[PDB]
Amino acid sequence: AELNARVNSLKRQLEEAEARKMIVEQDAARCQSRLSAAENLVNGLAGE
Amino acid sequence: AKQDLVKKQNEYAVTLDKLESDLLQSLSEADPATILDNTELIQNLDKT
Amino acid sequence: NILAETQNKVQGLQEELKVKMVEVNKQREETDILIEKVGKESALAEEE
């Protein structure tokens, strides 16, 4: 029973970690898209 | 073909001078954080 | 001159975005490795 309770707590922690990773990954993807747009704008400004 | 080209060169010269004048006023009016996400400015740089 | 100032601001924003991508991506990779290790431990603990 103690082992099962510890396993359940570990599983809840893992689910929380996965949610944090997912949101963190989406934030990173948004940041990458913003960086690419900024790079394109910088290239255009340099050409001008 | 020559006459059409000469009329096209005149047309293109008027369009280019409009684009340059549109860019200078659009950059000044737009904020530094808005310029990076502004769609009009990214489109304008490609057209030029 | 106006275009150069806008370009410098864009370059600074792009550099900060790239630094964030390098940092967020590195953090995500570390979190994924930790999650995989936790999953292997849970799989072993569950069998026991």
Q: Are A34 and B42 in contact (CB under 8 A)?
A: no
Q: Which of residues 4-33 of A touch C (CB under 8 A)?
A: 7, 10-11, 13-14, 17-18, 20-21, 24-25, 27-28, 31-32
Q: What is the Cα Rg of chain C in Å?
A: 21
Instruction: Report the candidate in C8, A38, A41 with the shortest Cα–Cα distance to residue B23.
Output: A41
Distance CA C8, CA C12 (A): 6
User: Any residues with CB less than 8 A from the CB of C43 and at least 6 apart, and which?
Assistant: none
Give the C-alpha separation, C9 to A25, whole Å: 27
Burial class (CB in 10 A: 0-12, 13-18, 19+), B1: exposed
Resolution of the coordinates in A?
4.5
Chains that touch B (3 or more CB pairs under 8 A): A, C
The DSSP code sequence of C9-39 is: HHHHHHHHHHHHHHHHHHHHHHHHHHHHHHH
With a CB cutoff of 8 Å and minimum separation 6, the contacts of C23 are none
- Asked if A35 has any chain B CB less than 8 Å from its own CB, the reply is no
The residue among B41, B21, C41 whose CA lies nearest residue A11 is C41
| DSSP states along A18-39 | HHHHHHHHHHHHHHHHHHHHHH
Dihedrals phi, psi of B30, to nearest 5 degrees: -70, 140
Per the CB < 8 A criterion, the answer to whether A31 and C20 are in contact is yes
Q: Measure the CA angle with vertex A35, ends A32 and A37; round to 5°.
A: 110
Would you call A17 exposed, middle or buried from its count of C-beta atoms within 10 A (0-12, 13-18, 19+)?
Answer: middle
Residues in Cβ contact with B19 at an 8 Å cutoff, skipping those fewer than 6 apart:
B44, B47, B48
Question: What number of other Cβ atoms are within 10 A of residue B43's Cβ?
Answer: 10
Method: cryo-EM
Distance from CA of C14 to the nearest CA of B (A): 9
Cα→Cα distances C19→A27, A45, B30, C13, C33, Å: 14, 21, 25, 10, 21
